[PDB]
Amino acid sequence: WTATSGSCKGRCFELQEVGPPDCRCDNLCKSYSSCCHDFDELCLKTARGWECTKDRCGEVRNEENACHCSEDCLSRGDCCTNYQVVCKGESHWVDDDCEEIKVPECPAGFVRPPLIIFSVDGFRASYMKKGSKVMPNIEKLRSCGTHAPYMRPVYPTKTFPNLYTLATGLYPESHGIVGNSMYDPVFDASFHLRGREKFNHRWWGGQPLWITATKQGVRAGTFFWSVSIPHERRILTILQWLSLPDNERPSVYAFYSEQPDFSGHKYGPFGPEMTNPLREIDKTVGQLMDGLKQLRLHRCVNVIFVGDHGMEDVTCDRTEFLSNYLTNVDDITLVPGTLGRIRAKSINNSKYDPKTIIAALTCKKPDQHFKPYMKQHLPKRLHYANNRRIEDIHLLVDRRWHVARKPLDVYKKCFFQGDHGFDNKVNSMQTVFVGYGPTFKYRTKVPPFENIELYNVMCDLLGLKPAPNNGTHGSLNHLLRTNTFRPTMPDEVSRPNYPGIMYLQSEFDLGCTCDDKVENKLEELNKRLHTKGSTKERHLLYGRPAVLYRTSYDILYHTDFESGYSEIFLMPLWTSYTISKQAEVSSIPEHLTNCVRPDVRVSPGFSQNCLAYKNDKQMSYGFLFPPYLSSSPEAKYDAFLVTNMVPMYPAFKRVWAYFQRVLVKKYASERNGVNVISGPIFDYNYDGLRDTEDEIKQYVEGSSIPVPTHYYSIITSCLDFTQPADKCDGPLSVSSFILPHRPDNDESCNSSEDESKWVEELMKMHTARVRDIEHLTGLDFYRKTSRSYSEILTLKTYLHTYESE
Ligand SMILES: *[C@@H]1O[C@H](CO)[C@@H](O[C@@H]2O[C@H](CO)[C@@H](O[C@@H]3O[C@H](CO[C@H]4O[C@H](CO)[C@@H](O)[C@H](O[C@H]5O[C@H](CO)[C@@H](O)[C@H](O)[C@@H]5O[C@H]5O[C@H](CO)[C@@H](O)[C@H](O)[C@@H]5O)[C@@H]4O)[C@@H](O)[C@H](O[C@H]4O[C@H](CO)[C@@H](O)[C@H](O)[C@@H]4O[C@H]4O[C@H](CO)[C@@H](O)[C@H](O)[C@@H]4O)[C@@H]3O)[C@H](O)[C@H]2NC(C)=O)[C@H](O)[C@H]1NC(C)=O
Ligand SMILES: COCC(=O)N1CCC(c2ccc3ncn(CC(=O)N(C)Cc4ccc(C#N)c(Cl)c4)c(=O)c3c2)CC1
Ligand SMILES: [Ca+2]
Ligand SMILES: [Ca+2]
Ligand code: NA
Numbered sequence: 177w178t179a180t181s182g183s184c185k186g187r188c189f190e191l192q193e194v195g196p197p198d199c200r201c202d203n204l205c206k207s208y209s210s211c212c213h214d215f216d217e218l219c220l221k222t223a224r225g226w227e228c229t230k231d232r233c234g235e236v237r238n239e240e241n242a243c244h245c246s247e248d249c250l251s252r253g254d255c256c257t258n259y260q261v262v263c264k265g266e267s268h269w270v271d272d273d274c275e276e277i278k279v280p281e282c283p284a285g286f287v288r289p290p291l292i293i294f295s296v297d298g299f300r301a302s303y304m305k306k307g308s309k310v311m312p313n314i315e316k317l318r319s320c321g322t323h324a325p326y327m328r329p330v331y332p333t334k335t336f337p338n339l340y341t342l343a344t345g346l347y348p349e350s351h352g353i354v355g356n357s358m359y360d361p362v363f364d365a366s367f368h369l370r371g372r373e374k375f376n377h378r379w380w381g382g383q384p385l386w387i388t389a390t391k392q393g394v395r396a397g398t399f400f401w402s403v404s405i406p407h408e409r410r411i412l413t414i415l416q417w418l419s420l421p422d423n424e425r426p427s428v429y430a431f432y433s434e435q436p437d438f439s440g441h442k443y444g445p446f447g448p449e450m451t452n453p454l455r456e457i458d459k460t461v462g463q464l465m466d467g468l469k470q471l472r473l474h475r476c477v478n479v480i481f482v483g484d485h486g487m488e489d490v491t492c493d494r495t496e497f498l499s500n501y502l503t504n505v506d507d508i509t510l511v512p513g514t515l516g517r518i519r520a521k522s523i524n525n526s527k528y529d530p531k532t533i534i535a536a537l538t539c540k541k542p543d544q545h546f547k548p549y550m551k552q553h554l555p556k557r558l559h560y561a562n563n564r565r566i567e568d569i570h571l572l573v574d575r576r577w578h579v580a581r582k583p584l585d586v587y588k589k590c591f592f593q594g595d596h597g598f599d600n601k602v603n604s605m606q607t608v609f610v611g612y613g614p615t616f617k618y619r620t621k622v623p624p625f626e627n628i629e630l631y632n633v634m635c636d637l638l639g640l641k642p643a644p645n646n647g648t649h650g651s652l653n654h655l656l657r658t659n660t661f662r663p664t665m666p667d668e669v670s671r672p673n674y675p676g677i678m679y680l681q682s683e684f685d686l687g688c689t690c691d692d693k694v695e696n697k698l699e700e701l702n703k704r705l706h707t708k709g710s711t712k713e714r715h716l717l718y719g720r721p722a723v724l725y726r727t728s729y730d731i732l733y734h735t736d737f738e739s740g741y742s743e744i745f746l747m748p749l750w751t752s753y754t755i756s757k758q759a760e761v762s763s764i765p766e767h768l769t770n771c772v773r774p775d776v777r778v779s780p781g782f783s784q785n786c787l788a789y790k791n792d793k794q795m796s797y798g799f800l801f802p803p804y805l806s807s808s809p810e811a812k813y814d815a816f817l818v819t820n821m822v823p824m825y826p827a828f829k830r831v832w833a834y835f836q837r838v839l840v841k842k843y844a845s846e847r848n849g850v851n852v853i854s855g856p857i858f859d860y861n862y863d864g865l866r867d868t869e870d871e872i873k874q875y876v877e878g879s880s881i882p883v884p885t886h887y888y889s890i891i892t893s894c895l896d897f898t899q900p901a902d903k904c905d906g907p908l909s910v911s912s913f914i915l916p917h918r919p920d921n922d923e924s925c926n927s928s929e930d931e932s933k934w935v936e937e938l939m940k941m942h943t944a945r946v947r948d949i950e951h952l953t954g955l956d957f958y959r960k961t962s963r964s965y966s967e968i969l970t971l972k973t974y975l976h977t978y979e980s981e
């Protein structure tokens with residue numbers, strides 16, 4: 177109930193929202209149908225349009241007009257945005273030369289440069305180049321300020337998850353807005369873009385920028401807008417708030433545009449109809465910049481021009497139907513479209529089996545345009561599992577395609593030609609970032625980066641301490657002229673032990689055998705030096721990783737590799753080795769096929785054992801440092817130490833052996849040497865964070881050997897590939913992966929073929945950031961380099977995407 181019989185007189189676009197049953201006058205009242213009776217009349221004036229003309233100059237004020245051209249308008253803060261241009265001989269902002277903003281040039285009373293965030297829905301990254309001839313204002317912001325060639329959205333690449341990620345610096349799994357459409361099984365409620373349900377605060381987690389600012393005494397309202405408020409009126413409202421008294425005026429502002437997304441869904445990303453919406457958005461930026469220039473704020477404010485996601489070509493006829501795969505299609509509920517999410521129709525149904533649904537959807541048609549996953553099996557880079565609103569069954573849909581339950585869902589609603597929501601590494605889903613103002617750099621291009629990083633930067637821009645979030649604070653310092661945050665390396669929590677030779681062979685009863693008894697002071701001191709760390713500078717190029725939790729571990733040195741060996745998990749946490757361009761690949765000798773050797777530095781009680789692998793009919797083993805890459809037949813014995821062994825399913829060993837025997841050498845050839853760090857990951861509760869010992873759900877049968885959920889590698893070389901990896905003087909280049917440790921290769925439809933036809937494709941799908949591995953391991957990498965810490969943080973957030981240009 178609303179008593180709509182109050183008034184908006186003197187209250188138009190008020191900042192403090194007033195509580196029902198009293199009527200409202202704020203920018204959201206229309207969405208709630210709760211505006212006062214006279215809101216349209218007083219707050220949504222339209223008379224005489226949005227622009228001054230020559231005949232209107234110095235007019236007598238008429239309060240009915242949409243905006244004003246009278247002499248008093250500048251002091252009232254309510255001129256039309258072109259007033260100085262038409263009536264005072266001023267130039268439009270876009271026609272002015274660009275001039276470096278070295279210091280903020282603000283009116284008296286401004287405590288700090290305001291921040292204006294201009295967000296555009298569906299603004300695909302390539303629009304910046306392809307539409308540049310029709311977007312002169314946007315082109316000036318881009319060429320004069322700081323810009324990236326593209327910005328990576330979060331998955332799913334939908335509106336509400338991405339806009340709220342921009343506001344919070346959190347993954348959708350953490351902020352709770354996991355789709356444009358969501359069902360919560362605990363609320364027994366569905367969230368849609370259309371409807372009142374989305375108004376309930378129970379959906380919205382984390383701490384958005386407006387709340388962060390308000391808590392710290394910086395004034396800021398929410399970033400939402402009612403759709404029916406026209407763009408010209410949103411801009412005039414922002415400019416009027418900027419003319420408020422010092423004690424009343426906000427420091428952060430948000431404009432939102434529904435375009436170009438709206439027309440993109442109808443016409444496709446590059447439909448001829450798309451030129452006009454891009455023109456109209458550019459005109460709106462022009463209105464803002466002209467308005468700022470009138471108020472002498474155009475060299476004071478920091479402006480961020482930012483998109484939520486791009487747009488792909490998608491039509492009705494490119495739809496896969498679940499009724500073509502399943503027979504029981506009426507026992508499921510599907511969230512459809514550019515992603516699929518599947519749950520049971522009824523919770524009273526104990527005859528609902530996710531296993532049988534997955535099997536009936538796996539590699540069933542040769543051209544199949546989607547792939548089913550249990551959520552914990554999705555690529556870890558998506559960070560899309562740790563929330564009750566994310567269904568156990570997920571469908572990853574090919575770009576350009578849709579999934580639907582039954583044909584009747586599609587014709588009983590071709591309409592549309594565009595859509596979005598696909599994997600966030602897809603080129604068509606990439607969006608835009610431009611920063612312009614005193615605090616951003618001048619005429620500067622930055623590498624592509626993830627939208628999760630922006631919350632920290634906006635906090636820096638406003639002098640705020642960020643709430644805990646998923647950005648890496650310092651990784652975007654290169655965007656800023658000043659206000660840089662000074663990041664520092666986390667302190668190491670556990671110091672390693674360095675064990676010497678402490679155990680005789682006969683103390684071990686591991687059930688292992690090796691043909692190694694086949695037997696010089698020249699070469700005995702030599703190998704003693706190797707065991708002491710003489711080759712360590714070759715194989716550990718960036719220092720040892722720091723362990724950021726409490727644990728018991730040993731450093732083990734060898735000719736060809738170094739490791740950090742966990743006495744708790746009975747295997748390395750990390751294994752580090754360098755392979756030059758000139759390195760040679762060899763075989764495992766016949767006599768060494770089943771060789772496993774006790775390590776006389778490590779107790780029998782803290783070792784794995786061969787008998788457990790013999791008894792476990794499902795589980796086999798592999799090695800972290802590959803025997804194929806030994807530097808000599810004598811060094812090869814080190815690779816068969818029990819302390820280099822890890823548990824591996826035979827299906828996974830096909831993947832791992834191909835990576836070790838073929839791909840490491842190929843990368844060494846291409847990149848002029850590589851340094852590799854490899855290791856296990858345990859994430860049984862799919863939270864993206866390292867498991868404690870008591871979270872492990874699976875062991876090698878009848879032992880205390882824990883089974884990893886994933887295996888990682890981090891592959892580093894010189895950015896200047898004319899220098900070898902082990903003698904690099906400048907910036908680094910990295911690619912990394914987090915491969916799921918699965919007992920089948922059901923994910924790869926071509927797995928019955930030779931590894932050369934499917935393994936590398938799998939690895940590409942499971943590409944990762946160094947920072948993702950750090951979360952999953954409690955390790956901190958690149959501790960000892962010649963590079964600045966901010967640069968290393970940028971390197972740790974890099975993702976190698978394997979898309980074209
Ligand atoms: C990305 O960045 C984010 C942000 O930094 C990282 O997420 C953080 O992870 C922390 C570790 O998991 C976690 O800290 C825990 O917080 C518990 C208190 O939780 C509430 O308070 C916070 C702070 O105000 C709030 O933000 C939380 O909000 C969540 O929940 C509501 C719904 O209730 C949502 O609206 C919101 O979207 C958000 O949901 C997300 O998080 C929850 C987990 O909290 C998930 O379940 C959701 O699916 C969703 O992802 C909460 O309202 C606190 O209780 C924890 O402490 C326990 O654990 C320690 C172990 O050290 C133990 O010593 C304590 O005793 C304690 O145990 C008690 O609780 C147990 C569980 O019920 C119980 O078994 C015991 O008996 C004890 O009573 C813990 O400190 C933090 O909340 C989140 N924050 C957010 C915002 O998500 C994220 O990890 C990053 N991702 C990556 C990959 O790096
Ligand atoms: C976290 O706080 C939640 C909260 O304050 N509320 C819950 C939500 C509640 C509410 C009330 C009325 C509304 N009217 C229109 N739209 C559309 C709308 O603005 N865009 C499409 C643009 C937009 C801009 C910023 C963000 C962010 N970030 C997002 Cl996601 C969307 C609402 O989304 C909307 C939301 C307002 C109260
Ligand atoms: Ca959108
Ligand atoms: Ca975990
Ligand atoms: Na076995």
Ligand code: NA
Nearest residue numbers: 921922924927
């Ligand atoms: Na297969």
Ligand SMILES: [Zn+2]
Nearest residue numbers: 298437441596
């Ligand atoms: Zn859309």
